[PDB]
Amino acid sequence: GMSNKFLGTWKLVSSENFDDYMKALGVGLATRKLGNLAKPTVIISKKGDIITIRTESTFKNTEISFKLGQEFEETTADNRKTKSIVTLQRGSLNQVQRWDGKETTIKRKLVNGKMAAECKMKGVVCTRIYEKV
Template identity: 40%
Template structure:
């Protein structure tokens, strides 16, 4: 008896319950104000037409060469095995301080949820930040936008093995997010299908 189908079925059941409750809602390309009750400050959610393709929720579809990529990162065997069982849900959002701003000063957030762990990274484009990945490795990372439909992330380990990786998220197809991953001489890819647009 194999454990993977049962784990996959359980993961998808949990994700379907989560998604049915509505992880994110909103209307693309419409500016809306959210009031923070504790500090009485106002922030604006402003999305250009291309940003409405970048933001939203996507569910894992399939991947190619992902275990080799994780091995190249130095992820231990047990965590690699768990990662291969997971069906992540990725939610990308963006908040800007001023209506006139398209990218300058905007705070982006990428949240990845699996049955095993969740991870959230907040960043501004072209500014270095740090985070601890799901495998426990602390990294420096920078995001930049290439054209209207790509977010390119560069990660470099802090401590641990001297490893850097590039993660290219391509949103040119409005029905999916294509992710290309590069570490050392290993290339991998994943496809996530859009389930909700913010």
């Protein structure tokens, strides 16, 4: 199943091309202004077959609870109301968000003890790297 070294609290240390990613998602100006200032905290936890990813930032908290492979509804930090699915591939937590026909993907991999999140919308590739506290 999902490796228990995902589990824990992560804080962002590196972000590349986040603004372009928000622009691809259609985030407005006022939200873009704030999103680039945030260095969120991500807390991954496991209760049975339910996985919970909680993102904490000064501007907004978000949380999603899900079972792998089972689709759920999600309101994103930027208030997209998506139907999303999380799957396990090759040690990669892979999330796909579906809304108004568009699609974006966030892939979370462990590398050297860090959590690297790759975010893909259209042709823009945002990479966000989290260190475990």
